[PDB]
């Protein structure tokens, strides 16, 4: 019935979602890097 | 009450973090279809 | 000296950083959409 | 102690959220230099 029981669960859930979404951002970094490589290679292959 | 103000901050931080994730998911798909959109042009240059 | 004084500040800071970074992600969406448009227009101009 | 465990969760959520922002900032710059990297090719097609 006490308050923290739902707060602690929320803070624990908040940090776990931040962790899996910080990983998601990491995969985005590599996604955009691969795109960068592809756009740069199209330009160099047009030079 | 600080323990009603807490529970608001946290519940709203959880909401805003689901907003952020929805943007990250949109980013992932926008990058993927941009990657595939380049494939034809890239192939044309061999 | 009490605990919550630093917790409440941290939770308030946590939510404010999430807000400004959720905006940052919004501008990223538009960044990548503009890039999408440019890559698609290069392909159509090559078709 | 729950109020020492709290203060850990929050302080570590703040740390992980600065990690996330550092990735978003890297994304912003990677997208910008990709946008400018396309300019020459795009100009070549008028």
Numbering used by the authors:
A (entry chain A), C (entry chain A): 2 to 48
B (entry chain B), D (entry chain B): 163 to 208
What does the paper say about this structure?
Our results supported a “two-arm” architecture of the STRIPAK complex, with the PP2Aa/c-bound STRNs acting as an organizing center to hold Hippo or other MST kinases with STRIP1 as one arm and SIKE1-SLMAP as the other. Moreover, we determined the crystal structures of the second coiled-coil domain of SIKE1 alone, and in complex with an STRN3 peptide, as well as the structure of the first coiled-coil domain of SIKE1 in complex with the first coiled-coil domain of SLMAP. SIKE1 functions to bridge SLMAP through CC1 on one hand and STRN3 through CC2 on the other. In particular, we discovered SIKE1 as a key adaptor that recruits MST-bound SLMAP to PP2A-bound STRN, forming a molecular arm MST-SLMAP-SIKE1-STRN-PP2Aa/c.
To further dissect at atomic level the SIKE1-SLMAP assembly, we determined the crystal structure of SIKE1 CC1 (residues 5–65) in complex with SLMAP CC1 (residues 167–226) at 2.3 Å resolution. An SIKE1 CC1 homodimer was interlaced with an SLMAP CC1 homodimer to assemble as a parallel four-helical bundle. A group of hydrophobic residues including I5, I8, A12, L15, L19, A26, L29, L36, V40, and M43 from SIKE1 CC1, and L168, L172, A175, L182, L186, L189, and L193 from SLMAP CC1 packed together to form a hydrophobic core. As shown in the bio-layer interferometry and MBP pulldown results, except for SIKE1-M43E, all other mutations on the complex interface including SIKE1 (L15D, L19D, L36D) and SLMAP (L182D, L186D, L189D, L193D) abolished the interactions between SIKE1 and SLMAP. Taken together, these results revealed a 2:2 heterotetrameric assembly of SIKE1-SLMAP and identified the leucine residues on the complex interface, namely L15, L19, and L36 of SIKE1 and L182, L186, L189, and L193 of SLMAP essential for SIKE1-SLMAP assembly. A further mapping experiment identified residues 5–65 of SIKE1 and residues 167–226 of SLMAP as the minimal regions mediating the interactions between the two proteins with a Kd of 6.9 μM. Meanwhile, SIKE1 CC1 can form a 2:2 hetrotetramer with SLMAP CC1. More importantly, SLMAP associated with STRN3 only in the presence of SIKE1. Together, these results indicated that SLMAP is recruited to STRN3 via SIKE1.
